[PDB]
């Protein structure tokens, strides 16, 4: 008569699979910052952690487990073996190759490709109907990589993309205006990183367009040098890395948000990295960031935004550049 029995009468052995599970691949700073942000936005009923640093993984699982009482996520798990990811709704990939000192962009991508050849097939093996959210950098390329390898349909392979840059862009637009980032509205689209496109037209507060009111906005003659708000957005990760080593907190929150729209099927619009062949006179299997309706099927629809002849040509080059790398990868 063990105590667990004396105390509790079981009605029902049954039960196998969980309902709203989320896997986070790789437990870096970014990894865990996603993990804590997801825990505390009560988005999953089971959370799986995967990496290859066996002892680190186990530590992060334990540390989180011990705060269980203060959370409404009842089962947390880890393992170097992907069987623990089984039946995930959403699977977030933060894992990748750490940059070497001399290393070409291609090599870094390729070594990411060779990693993704182990991870992505294992993810889809165990969670064949999952949506894949790629956070790893360079994200617009690695999203492609994980698309190619998974063979998931485009709607189920989503890049963190510019969801964070747009978040920074609004934070900073807010600082200037004395307004909360929620009420400040602006979009950074295209290649995540150095050559992203800050869409000045679609900036506004309460619906009164900044570009209309200030025609010179987003340009060199711009008395108010609003083009420097873009630059802060691009310089951001770097000046934060230079300051503290990495980014983590905002990326975690940014991803948490994305998972929320996916997990609760909210059909909100975020700018994420997605397969924009055909759109904007781009002809290659290339992922770029564009305002997308996220929900339980991942990206169900995407918003055709009006870019200038100018802003269009940016995305073109971003994608020529991208394909220029993408076509030298080795999958077989």
């Amino acid at each position: 008569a063990t105590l667990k029995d004396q105390l509790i009468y079981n009605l029902l052995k049954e039960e196998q699979t969980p309902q709203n599970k989320i896997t986070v691949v790789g437990v870096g700073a970014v990894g865990m910052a996603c993990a804590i942000s997801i825990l505390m936005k009560d988005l999953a009923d089971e959370l799986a952690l995967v990496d290859v640093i066996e002892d680190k993984l186990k530590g992060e699982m334990m540390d989180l487990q011990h705060g269980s009482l203060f959370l409404r996520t009842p089962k947390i798990v880890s393992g170097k073996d992907y069987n623990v990811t089984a039946n995930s709704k959403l699977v977030i990939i933060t894992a990748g190759a750490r940059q070497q000192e001399g290393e070409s962009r291609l090599n870094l991508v390729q070594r990411n490709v060779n990693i993704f050849k182990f991870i992505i097939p294992n993810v889809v093996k165990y969670s064949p109907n999952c949506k894949l959210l790629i956070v790893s950098n360079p994200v617009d390329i690695l999203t492609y990589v994980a698309w190619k390898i998974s063979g998931f349909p485009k709607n189920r392979v989503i890049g963190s993309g510019c969801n964070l840059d747009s978040a920074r862009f609004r934070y900073l637009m807010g600082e200037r205006l004395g307004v909360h980032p929620l009420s400040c509205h602006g979009w950074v689209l295209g290649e995540h990183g150095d050559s992203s496109v800050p869409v000045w037209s679609g900036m506004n507060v309460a619906g009164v367009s900044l570009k209309t009111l200030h025609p010179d906005l987003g340009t060199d003659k711009d008395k108010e040098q609003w083009k420097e708000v873009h630059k802060q957005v691009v310089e951001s990760a770097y000046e934060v890395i230079k300051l503290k080593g990495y980014t983590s907190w905002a990326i975690g929150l940014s991803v948490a948000d994305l998972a929320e729209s996916i997990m609760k099927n909210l059909r909100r619009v975020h700018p994420v990295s997605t397969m924009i062949k055909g759109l904007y006179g781009i002809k290659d299997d290339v992922f770029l960031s564009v305002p997308c309706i996220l929900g339980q099927n991942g990206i169900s629809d995407l918003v055709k935004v009006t870019l200038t002849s100018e802003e269009e040509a940016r995305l073109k080059k971003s994608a020529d550049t991208l394909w220029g790398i993408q076509k030298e990868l080795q999958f077989h």
Copy 2:
């Protein structure tokens, strides 16, 4: 006018004084875990980070800010100068002195004293009605230190104590019983240490005593070896640290729980560390963990747990030890 000004008539510029501010001191893992935890329970309208490493500090401020859009906490600030702490409701001290290979228990506490000699009277100079939460270890003794230096009354100086220690005890209880830890109950009391006292008299589910059910519970002849659960409670920071380098996430979640009860005036009972001279035959100015009613003036009352002679001795000895260390500190 500017763009700001043709879009936004100003009705009145006004000196805001912050209404529900929370300062966090030290931005190590425990530092930031407490801040990310607090940020996401929306417990404050202004967070202030303070440390001595300006570059690190400032990175963390920005990386927090950069997901301001995802948060309902509109002002985040950081500085090395304690004026950024102005008007805090609750100040949380994670900061301290870093142990030195062969350093002595007491010498370590004295460097802690010196640091608190700077940190504390600055904190009180700029938020003289604040509550102090001491998270920094050795907790029970450093809570005494900040009380003695702050000149605050015993109710506004609070140690993070065994609040976490008990949360672990309940996680573990939970995983053994198959019940959420919200619904498994148990109290780890006394020195947040190896000496921590697992009160078996109290362990219940749904108010059914585990002791009256299986009276070997917590004893050497206990075939279910329930004592191990406590051992595991005691050795967790060690096992986690060994596995991941530090601990953070549980302690952060735990502190935010206290922050909730304090900031939200809840009057829940948590096991924190407070002055308990008088109780359980304790005679000296010592601090230990005892179930406390927490609310907006910190500790208003504290629950009188009944203890077996052995348990009472444990606590007394705990206090004997701690007075032992406290009595060779040097303040002035």
Copy 3:
């Protein structure tokens, strides 16, 4: 092409399968009070109302729908037809028979059987895998009813039972002690209503038995008349009804909590009305509240509270009372 198709390019034909759908039968005060508290606890990706009063139902639906902007539950639907309930995980029944002055108690019960005859098989026709939460009164009979009619296994039919009663009990207990109900513990078990049993043994704060401490607790010699804390609990429903005409808000929150546990698979222990034929020397086919663990599978296990042969006697006499009514009900 229309404006919509201009703006938004779609990718996927929305299957539109709903994941965490909840339905509310009856849009009473209680029905909406559940609906609104569920919407505010982000527990569903689709809510469905169903009642016979059509002009009313549509109105409630349209109003909830209008606050859509401040909720994260993207699809709220209503209908005379139970076809809208389809794919519900949880179906919460508030519907029932409005009492008639002079009617026997048996008839009222019977009229309720007679509308569950229409409701329940309509609910299981469209959502064969759902969990039934019965809130309707008398709740322990109508659970037996829904259970018999549904033919669902016992674990997927749950009475609202004495969940609320214990929340009142805890509330009141806290009043006296000066503690939040969260930290005051005590369990009210058996038949929801005049015969419900306060289990004094299990009353505690922090792990300390009030019953041990004050062994008179809840007899009549009790200088503190703690027995009144029960009577206030039973007469609370009546007392509110006399003052505003019904209760809605507390029962609302109480049901949102049951839902949370079920929908999030928390396995927290709630005192809900389940089948207890087998325990407490009951050999009928009766539903009474007992502390149950609540999961995605409904009631998975249940706690075996130790009762004084007195407490047992009431429970047994409740079950006769109840069966003697139940055995007279017409069903086919």
Copy 4:
């Protein structure tokens, strides 16, 4: 030795002003949806219910109290005396006259006035530093009336105005588009009710104007009749009423949100009835809804919307109309 004595050692007390206290005047369906909606978004530490029906008041208070276990708002107090409202950071008024079959516009607001000379003075008497949120009934005037009687700075007297109207417009915009309301943007401003102006120019998703993408949007010669959405916005409260009796749920969540902005100092922008003596022609003391930044100081700044001469001149007339009533009042 009481049980308390044996269980709880008691430390010395210090005093205790409540720290984030919200009071709701009027426990009608609107009042109470405001009450529960605030309780669930954990915006207060004290909630005060006040009205004149006193049996009802105490019943609603007990009922909320019994759910205390499921909330983190540890004091709910009610009463017919306005001392229960003391130290309210935010006080939300729903009380007011109820129009009768016979009544005209001008008599109903003169009564609202008289009821307000009882309530408003009493609210300030015990919480002189509150922000009045007027939900009342006929808002853009009663907000004026609270402002005049309280004697408070224009910023601390805020009408719900078209806050709710905009959320209804966003829901509907939402509908046609296949997009959550959070990600749909559009604004209804001015006289809450029949005269509310849907700023077609400002309608968008992801910053792409609809007026620019489909130039007959919201005009009469519109193929997919988008004007109907804004008809529907004025229709809805006056249509649900038809269907259910009153409106509650949406108004509650609307107010709650304004409460969140106020109580946490979000400086989020909200279309609220504020005193726009200075814009659009309006050289008159009137409140109308325009987008405003709600901080902890009430309405701290506002947004100057560019408007079609059609839109300007509707507000202009909204404001003429309102001053035409307001001038005939007396205090």
